[PDB]
């Protein structure tokens, strides 16, 4: 029934890279969408989807000491209702 990603964290960072880490259900979960940008910008980083089979995974392209909003998309549905999940963000300096 836990149809909510939890456990949100970080691992580890690198000098050039970042490794998050967070929660995929147990249901028939299609895909994921991971964005991130800075906080107050007129031009997100990136984001990309992933058949949410990993509940890991690691990024690049970022830079050290500054404000980091990652929102993830978890989107699961089923044969024809969207069903819009709820989509969560968070705030964390990196």
Do not use: C, H, M
């Amino acid at each position: 029934v836990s149809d909510v990603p939890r456990d949100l964290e970080v691992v580890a960072a690198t000098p050039t890279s970042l490794l998050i880490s967070w929660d995929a259900p147990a249901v028939t979960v299609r895909y994921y969408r991971i964005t991130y940008g800075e906080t107050g910008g007129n031009s997100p980083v990136q984001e990309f989807t992933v058949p949410g089979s990993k509940s890991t995974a690691t990024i690049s392209g970022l830079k050290p000491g500054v404000d980091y909003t990652i929102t993830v998309y978890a989107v699961t549905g089923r044969g024809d209702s969207p069903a819009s999940s709820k989509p969560i963000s968070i705030n964390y300096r990196t």
